[PDB]
């Protein structure tokens, strides 16, 4: 064992919540459209991916006696008797995204999801971790929980526990943008416009003064009125006024655009996916997004599951519609490989997502 | 079973409606061109897609005894004896889009649509969910309803129930734009 | 669209126990290019990976009850 | 922000002065109000004021952009990965990032491990999704090398991340 | 930064003067306030001031870019490697850097 695990325990006995503002998070998610779209895109893309259970690693694991078919059914078909696979995956992904850590409880035969807003992980003096405390009371144990953690740098030292959430980082930019937008709308609402100003040095009959104010305003409007010439008699003048505060000084386009780009950068969604563009803009950006953003996020979970069960579990899409390969190039390279002898026909059929055919010459290499 | 389902029930016993402004939603849908076009495009595109029933998974399900052909006819040809497949799909999709969740009641031999604006989902202390309350009265049960939920982050905790509607995010920018347009037209009208 | 329908199909699969997946294959806006489809289908059929009946099914035609269309040519 | 400034040389009834201030502000707003013409009687004037400090002098876009450029440079991530771009740009930048930034960093660790244990340890991705090679070019060069005789079939299968097949003619060079 | 300058030729009660300074500043901000019109009584005027030193005269982009380019030139790293570009920019620049430097 590690001789200095006690020191690391004393440095940070328990986990710390890293989602400092949950209510503001919920309000921004509920009333800001960029946040809603990006978060929904990330969660749906992560939940779309499937899982594959392969070889068995000869190591001692927390959960033993579990067959490959049971894992295949749990991860793919239906984890709980009472909950969907899509709902389970989306809940786990949103827990991981909004909160630094995510947890999945392991029952005798099924995987139950546990919210991460109430979990508090307690470190151990000797090995790694002593116990998990769901809010309070229950005190799960350790053998029954799968632990997924994002890399975090809290306070001074990096933590073996806890985890830092991507959505908190974005919370300031939305506030900064919303303040400016509300400022613009309130400036428009409270502004005043004046068309004509007349000045006199005498007290001219307030009532008929207001009557003349109405009369001139109606008459000189070119939409409803047919007057253009004004004759001022009695000494009345016209002050050549100007506009003090105009709406052209408020140039908020660049700042709002920068805040939007910063939000998209923080979540990791490429700009082209949100806007749309040419084919060369479309497909490589989809591949970049899916692979380089989602696949590490699922890789954390798959590594945790591999540690827990002892079976090689890797993310495998191979069905996602947005990752559908080009038909012509796929056919060309598969047929070339099959004809030249590198791969059998059955392997090509499997890669085409078809079913292997029980022939004789398709299980032997042609040349 | 989960040893801590009681705590999750205590946190969120019942569902919460996330369509805060329904009347403003309806008025904007009725009198805004971009909202109408985008919503119609999404709903029609979702309703265009068909469904395929394939292999049978050897698990114990809520509804058993249904053959492949009957399910295929229900999903594709004609769900109810009294309503269209296109109308059924469009209703389900618009319920899912405007309200966070959508529901489909399961009768003896056919699928009946139930609006999501009135149903309230009651969580269970032990397993997942106790009953669905259609406004009031009925208390359907659970075995008779298909539940579809969008991912939601309400208040502080993400709920296993409820769901967050995409159209409400818009009911802010639409008002901001309409105010500016009306300001422009009235400034033009009142000028001299 | 497809994730939106995927939630519904996953719920239906849980409810009924039948693998239900979204499948367009008929949507006019998703009509594939005729020439590229013909090229890749004919290459796959001739080289031996895919039988003729599978190609007809992917062309949204009906299977034809022949003898040499249910066996791999080469 | 100020819309209108009126000045007078006499003390005109503070309370009704404020009432007139709110009345004019409500009336002359084109959003809620239908007045455009104003008459000043009794000697009240209007000072043609201007704006001292505007929001157009605060041009901060370039400096903030430069700070972002410097941060991205300091860590080493090509900017196209963060922003996104065309077909040609999107793959070479991924390769440049991974190789130049990551691989030396893992190379330090692998050299230390080789010193510690005495086994040649080298970083090997060959599985990273973002480094997935082009299918057509890979097939072309592998098939050419296999057919011409430089590389056996088993080596090609291994490079394709498949499993070696226990045949006879795949462990001997064809020509 | 200054928004309004009002001038008077009399000693008008410093304390209430500061109170009015706070009141006008809070009232006339469109973020928190619903007033747009001001009336000056008693002889108080408004000086049309301007801005002496602005932030637009400080154009430092070109000089900083020149210094960064000079540093990169001194070490020998091509600018494209630091910024990133197209494939024809990526590979030849990598080869040039490695070889020549």
Residue numbers in the entry:
A (entry chain E): 11 to 377
B (entry chain D): 11 to 202
C (entry chain D): 304 to 377
D (entry chain F): 203 to 377
E (entry chain G): 203 to 303
Q: Please, what does the article write about this entry?
A:
Bacteriophage T5, a representative member of the T5-like family of siphophages, serves as an excellent model for studying the assembly, infection, cell wall perforation, and DNA ejection mechanisms of this phage family. In this study, we used cryo-electron microscopy (cryo-EM) to determine the structures of mature T5 (a laboratory-adapted, fiberless T5 mutant) and urea-treated empty T5 (lacking the tip complex) at near-atomic resolutions. The T5 tail, which comprises 40 trimeric rings of the TTP and a distal tip complex, is connected to a unique five-fold vertex of the head by the connector complex.
Using the local reconstruction method, we then obtained the structures of the connector complex and the portal of mature T5 at resolutions of 4.8 and 3.2 Å, respectively. The T5 portal consists of 12 copies of pb7, which replaces a penton at a unique vertex of the head and provides an entry and exit channel for DNA packaging and ejection. According to the domain nomenclature of the portal protein, each pb7 monomer can be divided into four domains: a crown domain (residues 337–377), a wing domain (residues 11–175, and 278–336), a stem domain (residues 176–200, and 263–277), and a clip domain (residues 201–262). Imposing C12 symmetry on the portal by means of local reconstruction revealed that the wing domain’s positively charged residue, lys77, was anchored to the DNA fragment, clearly indicating the major and minor grooves of the double-stranded DNA. We built an atomic model of adaptor protein p144 comprising all 170 residues. The adaptor is composed of 12 copies of p144, exhibiting structurally conserved conformation, as observed in many phages. Each p144 monomer contains an attachment domain (residues 46–110) and a helix bundle domain (residues 1–45 and 111–170). The attachment domain is anchored to the outer surface of the portal, whereas the helix bundle domain is attached to the top of the tail terminator. Notably, the loop (residues 14–20) of the helix bundle domain between two adjacent p144 monomers undergoes conformational changes to mediate the structural symmetry mismatch between the 12-fold symmetric adaptor and the 6-fold symmetric tail terminator p142.
